[PDB]
Amino acid sequence: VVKFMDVYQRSYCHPIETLVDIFQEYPDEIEYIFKPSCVPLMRAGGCCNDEGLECVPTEESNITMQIMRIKPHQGQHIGEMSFLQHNKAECRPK
Amino acid sequence: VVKFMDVYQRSYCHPIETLVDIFQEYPDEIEYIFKPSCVPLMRAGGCCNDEGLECVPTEESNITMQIMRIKPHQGQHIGEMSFLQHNKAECRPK
Numbered sequence: 001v002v003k004f005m006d007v008y009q010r011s012y013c014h015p016i017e018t019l020v021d022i023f024q025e026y027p028d029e030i031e032y033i034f035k036p037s038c039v040p041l042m043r044a045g046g047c048c049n050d051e052g053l054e055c056v057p058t059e060e061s062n063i064t065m066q067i068m069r070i071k072p073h074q075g076q077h078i079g080e081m082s083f084l085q086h087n088k089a090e091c092r093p094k
Numbered sequence: 095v096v097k098f099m100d101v102y103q104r105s106y107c108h109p110i111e112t113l114v115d116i117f118q119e120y121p122d123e124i125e126y127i128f129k130p131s132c133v134p135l136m137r138a139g140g141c142c143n144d145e146g147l148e149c150v151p152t153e154e155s156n157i158t159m160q161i162m163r164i165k166p167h168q169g170q171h172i173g174e175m176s177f178l179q180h181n182k183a184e185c186r187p188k
Binding site for chain 1: 095096097098101102104105106110111113115129130131132133134139140141143157158159160161162172174
């Protein structure tokens with residue numbers, strides 16, 4: 001059984017590795033097929049224990065990954081894509 | 095720049111630490127109060143890069159944690175709660 005102090009600390013609002021579907025970040029590119037179709041990004045997660053607060057990113061930056069992009073019957077290429085990352089996260093008023 | 099192959103394998107379907115709101119896990123106990131309000135759980139995540147496959151849990155099990163809970167009109171007592179975890183996850187034919 002996990003100790004309360006662990007549960008409490010771990011579950012607390014922090015940037016956590018999150019698998020994000022590429023379409024969420026590049027919705028204009030829906031007719032394309034991405035390989036892989038999701039990228040691992042550090043995003044604000046966890047809960048606050050103050051009700052009136054909510055976990056929100058406070059320091060952002062972009063990261064670049066090589067992604068295969070495919071257009072059915074027209075082309076394919078492996079190129080770089082920028083994704084939004086959360087370098088810092090903290091609880092704040094709603 | 096993260097290399098194509100590293101991104102590809104880092105996001106392919108597998109159990110990944112996921113912050114799960116406790117209210118969600120226990121639809122009944124909504125009047126209850128929990129702290130922390132969410133727990134860190136291993137859950138299937140990521141993508142299959144194949145239209146015929148979906149990412150699903152394949153070997154589950156419960157994990158127990160100490161949660162300071164407050165059943166309305168009672169005290170604020172630590173308690174052991176069981177949460178569903180995903181030990182193994184793989185792409186399986188949709």
